[PDB]
Structure 1
Amino acid sequence: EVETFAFQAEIAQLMSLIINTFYSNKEIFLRELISNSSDALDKIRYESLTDPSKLDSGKELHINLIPNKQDRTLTIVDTGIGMTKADLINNLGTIAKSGTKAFMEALQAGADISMIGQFGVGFYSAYLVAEKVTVITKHNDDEQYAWESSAGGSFTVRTDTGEPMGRGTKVILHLKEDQTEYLEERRIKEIVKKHSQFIGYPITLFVEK
């Protein structure tokens, strides 16, 4: 059972701007998704401060980066608060309509795409490097779901029958043919050291073969 949804017009406009605008500094996608993961980990930690059972689904709070050259995917895993089905449909838990509005007025006022994160819609910078994005998520109050979109105006949501997560969010980036540099160990390490050196959670870069 797979449900298909239309993006709100403003969000469709944002993703086409990200996909079509010439902008060479694509590496900021990773900073934005790691920062999103850190925000989600902050939220489950705060909730657990007054109710420890919120961590029965997983005590460890961390971020993993998993490149896979065979599948040409880069996956960002965190054990944060996760997302409900309603959250996924609701622009992945963001205020994306008002955020896109403020972002686009900022761009005509001197901004560039790199401050997308200041407007709450940093997730969509994933489409600087990915032709398709899959999001697997598990929230304590809901079941495990999978979100997917290749842009073009629509996204899908289905119950995920894959590997159980426990709690958190998995962003799978199906990389464009000319963006495979972000599967290289020394290139990921350079970006994490440049942009994410102060994230308050352990970031583990997996190796291959």
Structure 2
Amino acid sequence: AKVETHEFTAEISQLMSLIINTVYSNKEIFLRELISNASDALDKIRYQALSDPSQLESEPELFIRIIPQKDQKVLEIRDSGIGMTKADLVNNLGTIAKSGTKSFMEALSAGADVSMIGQFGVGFYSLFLVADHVQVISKHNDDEQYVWESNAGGKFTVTLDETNERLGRGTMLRLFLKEDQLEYLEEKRIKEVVKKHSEFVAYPIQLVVTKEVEK
């Protein structure tokens, strides 16, 4: 029930600061990166389930789901992948992301396009192109549901989740969109971006659209 506060490694903190402030033109690539991450998580539970099919019982369906929350200025990206335990969420520290982070910053200084972020293994942080904070809600078969929260500063929190929908298994990124990036709440725009950048994905990409029933 306590909010545990933790500190990012310096390299991650520095990368988030670069990304949240960059004026890069092609911000829509964040969605490709997050879909790719969702797919990779799905691959991992599929791999487990091939050995042990009972691993799917927590959430039998394998999906990626995009849920615009217009009234909240939030975009949710949900998967039924393997998920993250509390210890996984706390351990972006002491992880391959440290290496990816530093190398990627050096590449940026050399002129690399921001769209190369996923080649360094740190495409998760591309969400700060369009969002000023994020909650990562996650449920792994081995642990309870937790929420990790970051505003691109030096600290993050991890809290036992007593306030969100039950995921069953997997991860949901809740992106609090920047005021100039609200185009990513619109059905038409999300479809365009998915079609352009995420043609080859093994799992259904479900878009949740809210429409008024009219006469």
8 Å contact kept, 2:22–2:129 = no
Q: Which moved more, 1:89-98 or 1:79-88?
A: 89-98
8 Å contact kept, 2:9–2:93 = no
Task: Decide which of 139, 153, 165 is 1:163's aligned counterpart.
Answer: 165
8 Å contact kept, 1:138–1:169 = yes
The alignment status of 1:66 with 2:67, answered yes or no, reads yes
CA distance in 1, matches of 2:102, 2:115: 16
Amino acid aligned to 1:18: I
Shift in Å at residue 22 of structure 1?
2.1
8 Å contact kept, 1:74–1:174 = yes
Q: Which residue of 2 aligns with 1:8?
A: 9
Shift in Å at residue 20 of structure 1?
1.9
Once the two structures are superposed, the pairs formed by residues 61-100 of structure 1 within 5 Å of their partners are 61-91=62-92, 95-100=96-101
Shift in Å at residue 31 of structure 1?
0.3
Amino acid aligned to 1:73: V
Q: Which residue of 2 aligns with 1:127?
A: 128
The alignment status of 1:202 with 2:204, answered yes or no, reads yes
CA distance in 2, matches of 1:117, 1:68: 26
Shift in Å at residue 107 of structure 1?
2.0
Amino acid aligned to 1:12: S
Amino acid aligned to 1:151: A
Shift in Å at residue 115 of structure 1?
0.7
Question: When the two structures are aligned, how many residues end up with a matched partner?
Answer: 209
Question: Which 4+ runs in 1 deviate beyond 6 A?
Answer: none
Which string of whole-angstrom CA distances, capped at 9 and with x for unpartnered residues, describes residues 20-48 of structure 1? 22211100100000000000000000011
Q: Judging changes above 3 Å, is the alpha-carbon distance between structure 1 residues 70 and 170 closer, same or farther for their aligned structure 2 residues?
A: same
Shift in Å at residue 106 of structure 1?
2.0
The alignment status of 1:187 with 2:211, answered yes or no, reads no
Shift in Å at residue 176 of structure 1?
0.7
Q: Which moved more, 1:160-169 or 1:78-87?
A: 160-169
CA distance in 2, matches of 1:141, 1:183: 33
Amino acid aligned to 2:185: L
Shift in Å at residue 92 of structure 1?
8.3
CA distance in 1, matches of 2:148, 2:124: 13
Shift in Å at residue 148 of structure 1?
0.6
Q: Which moved more, 1:23-32 or 1:161-170?
A: 161-170
Amino acid aligned to 1:185: E
Amino acid aligned to 2:107: A
Once the two structures are superposed, the pairs formed by residues 149-160 of structure 1 within 5 Å of their partners are 149-160=150-161
8 Å contact kept, 1:83–1:92 = no
CA distance in 2, matches of 1:60, 1:50: 17
Which string of whole-angstrom CA distances, capped at 9 and with x for unpartnered residues, describes residues 53-75 of structure 1? 11111111001100111011100
What is the alpha-carbon root mean square deviation over aligned residues? 1.3
Amino acid aligned to 1:158: T
Unaligned 5+ runs, structure 2: none
Q: Judging changes above 3 Å, is the alpha-carbon distance between structure 1 residues 151 and 88 closer, same or farther for their aligned structure 2 residues?
A: same
